[PDB]
């Protein structure tokens, strides 16, 4: 049967297997004709030098342009001849390579995947194409204010470390890159332990490990500076101003990493077309909608290795912008003193509701494994999560926020029409209450 208490017990577990040159193997059985194979890479933007910036991005594009053994677009046809979907993606820390596929065609997959992981056709045929394509994109990427505002925020505090820099880097290196640096950066960071391998589907471990199959894998970080500051780009043309706010936070692995999950569960989030209405429980979700002090808002949480980010991202008309800012803060502050057990239950429930629903479909488990390995390693503390959740207490919370919020130094990320944005020194003397 199924009981939420029992259901934590019956799981196919993650698998652990090592290679000799540092590649890790792992797996879980979905009793499924299909399987999601992937490869995770911890090579971060913060590893690359300033000149090296945007390379891997540029590189990521180069992968499926044909590889050392298999030239351009004979590659896709096969995977297409198979019928398999193929995709990859990047992030300041992490780059991804993965495929959704049946368990049948699995054997080629690895040996297909494996080849391109390191062996790469390096030809200036693409170098200019992509460069132009990228120069196309770089100039086109200016369209979404969202992706715009982020990078500002990184550079805001994380100035002084590579962490803040663009994934795609300066437009100039886009022109200025020789594939030597590529091969060189291909050279350095693609040996293991950097490499991490997994997959999920109807595959049992051993029938993976056999065909994990003799091919290959392989043969620096610093504390980033956390800077209280502001950034303002004032432009009066557009209708709205994306504005979000943040303060630094703990690294990936830490107990506090748990409490923060429920922290944002408290505030909730509102946007235009939610069916929410005025009756919502979350104080701002109702009120900031009541006068539509926001068209939309949400929150974010991301915890780096040694670092973490906390805050919310919101959208409203300009003349009223002051409102959100005033009425956002207390929803932190009132927590810091007066907070309550029952109010957490739902959030306690929600995060419980949240993580459970995360597990549908083949691929999502596959992706989890990679970061997990890069983050906590093997750990899939599935039921333990609840235990990690059962940890939570009203005091526990009012202990947490005590750390990172009450009278701290925030940073300010904003984009036109910033104009009415309350000045900095308010926000600062506005973070900590005077008790009102």
């Amino acid at each position: 049967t199924a009981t939420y208490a029992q259901a934590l017990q019956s799981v196919p577990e993650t698998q652990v297997s090592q290679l000799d040159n540092g590649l890790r193997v792992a797996s879980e059985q979905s009793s499924q004709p299909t399987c999601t194979v992937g490869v995770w890479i911890d090579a971060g933007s913060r590893y690359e030098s300033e000149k090296n910036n945007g390379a891997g991005y540029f590189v990521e594009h180069l992968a499926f342009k044909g590889t050392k053994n298999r030239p351009g677009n004979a590659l896709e046809k096969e995977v297409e001849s198979m019928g398999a979907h193929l995709n990859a993606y990047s992030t300041r820390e992490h780059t991804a390579y993965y495929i959704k596929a049946l368990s049948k065609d699995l054997p080629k997959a690895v040996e297909l995947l494996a080849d391109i992981v390191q062996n790469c056709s390096l030809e200036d045929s693409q170098i200019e194409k992509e460069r132009d394509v990228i120069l196309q994109e770089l100039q086109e990427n200016d369209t979404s204010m969202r992706d715009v505002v982020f990078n500002y925020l990184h550079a805001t505090a994380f100035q002084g470390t590579p962490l803040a820099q663009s994934v795609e880097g300066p437009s100039e290196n886009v022109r200025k890159l020789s594939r030597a640096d590529l091969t060189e950066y291909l050279s350095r960071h693609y040996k293991a332990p950097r490499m991490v391998l997994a997959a999920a589907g109807g595959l049992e471990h051993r029938q993976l490990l056999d065909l994990a199959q003799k091919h290959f894998s392989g043969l620096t970080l610093s504390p980033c500076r956390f800077t209280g500051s502001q950034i303002c780009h004032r432009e009066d043309g557009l209708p709205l101003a994306h504005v979000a706010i943040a303060v630094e936070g703990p690294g990936w692995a830490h107990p506090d990493n748990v409490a923060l999950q429920v922290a944002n569960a408290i505030i909730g989030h509102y946007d235009c077309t939610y069916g929410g209405g005025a009756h919502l429980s979350s104080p701002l979700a109702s009120i900031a909608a009541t006068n539509k002090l926001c068209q939309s808002f949400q929150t974010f949480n991301i915890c780096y290795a040694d670092t973490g980010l906390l805050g919310a991202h919101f959208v409203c008309d300009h003349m009223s912008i002051d409102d959100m800012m005033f009425v956002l803060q207390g929803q932190w502050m009132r927590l810091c003193t007066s907070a309550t057990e029952s109010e957490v239950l739902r959030g306690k429930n929600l995060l419980r509701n949240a993580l459970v629903s995360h597990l549908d479909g083949t691929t999502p488990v596959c992706e989890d494994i990679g970061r997990s390995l890069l983050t906590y390693g093997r750990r899939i503390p599935l039921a333990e999560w609840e235990s990690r959740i059962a940890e939570v207490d009203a005091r526990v919370v009012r202990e947490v926020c005590s750390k990172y919020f009450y009278d701290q130094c925030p940073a300010v990320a904003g984009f036109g029409p910033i104009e009415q944005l309350p000045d900095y020194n308010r926000i600062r003397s506005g973070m900590f209450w005077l008790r009102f």
Binding site: T337, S338, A339, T340, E341, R398
Partner: protein, 39 residues
């Protein structure tokens, strides 16, 4: 409900202060010299 939180101690902390104020003001009493008090 009432969950009467650190506010209660906070409250407990508030009034304590200005209570001194009166004593420190000019409408208090004469405590045991307790660090110099002229006669």
């Amino acid at each position: 409900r009432q969950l009467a939180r650190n506010w209660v101690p906070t409250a407990s902390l508030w009034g304590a202060v200005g209570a001194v104020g009166l004593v420190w003001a000019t409408d208090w009493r004469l405590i045991l010299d307790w660090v110099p008090y002229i006669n």
